[PDB]
Amino acid sequence: DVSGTVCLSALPPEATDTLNLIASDGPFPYSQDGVVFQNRESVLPTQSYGYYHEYTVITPGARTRGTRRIITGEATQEDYYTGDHYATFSLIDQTC
Amino acid sequence: DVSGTVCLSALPPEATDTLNLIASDGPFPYSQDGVVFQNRESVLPTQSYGYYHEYTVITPGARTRGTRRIITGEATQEDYYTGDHYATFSLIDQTC
């Protein structure tokens, strides 16, 4: 399940950067950006394969990709944030 | 024959999710949710066609709809669990 909705303004500023890159279709900093998210554990709503894609939200100072991501769904405004490597998700509200 | 009664708290958590959806009549995750269960091998009591319906119990980690299902009958609380693709069934006790 999804934890609830969070305003974009209440998430780390790097989440705003990632959403801006998704709207322009890149370029993305990481090679993994844009790959399909399988939702193997069924935390998000069940959908067809390819419905979900994953993008990095940079963690300042990290050497690796870290634990923060945005998962897009195919529906309008359907974007989920995770700050714990896919354990929990919140829907992002871009209007606040 | 129904193989016994099982407490709802003993089943995987997704069985509770499915029973909640059945109570609200969905919307369901799969298009096959809510089809008639034919009871072809007569494991459950014999009834007219249409008496039983089947619903998916999601299995996290599976690549398919998996083997877990809830079958409803028309009587109150008549809900059966199968974890083995219709081989065996237990009546669910929602009070424990």
Swiss-Prot record, chains A, B:
Q: Which domain of life is it from?
A: Bacteria
The EC code for this enzyme is: 4.6.1.24
Q: Where in or outside the cell?
A: Secreted
UniProt GO MF annotations:
lyase activity; ribonuclease T1 activity; RNA binding; RNA endonuclease activity
Q: Which residues cross the membrane?
A: none
Q: Record keywords: Transcription regulation included?
A: no
What is this enzyme's catalytic activity, as reactions?
[RNA] containing guanosine + H2O = an [RNA fragment]-3'-guanosine-3'-phosphate + a 5'-hydroxy-ribonucleotide-3'-[RNA fragment]
What Pfam families is this protein classified in? Ribonuclease
In its keyword annotation, does this UniProt entry include Ribosomal protein? Answer: no
Which UniProt keyword terms apply here?
A: Disulfide bond, Endonuclease, Hydrolase, Lyase, Nuclease, Secreted
A cellular component term from Gene Ontology for this protein is: extracellular region
The main place the protein resides is: secreted
The active site is formed by 54, 85
Q: Which InterPro entries match?
A: N1-like (IPR000026), Ribonuclease/ribotoxin (IPR016191)
Disulfide bonds, which pairs? 7-96
SUPFAM superfamilies to which the protein is assigned, alphabetical: Microbial ribonucleases
Coiled-coil features, chain-numbered ranges: none
Which family does the similarity line name?
Belongs to the ribonuclease N1/T1 family.
By what name is this protein known?
Guanyl-specific ribonuclease Sa
- What organism is this sequence from? Kitasatospora aureofaciens (Streptomyces aureofaciens)
Q: Which lineage is the organism of this entry classified under, starting from the top rank? A: Bacteria, Bacillati, Actinomycetota, Actinomycetes, Kitasatosporales
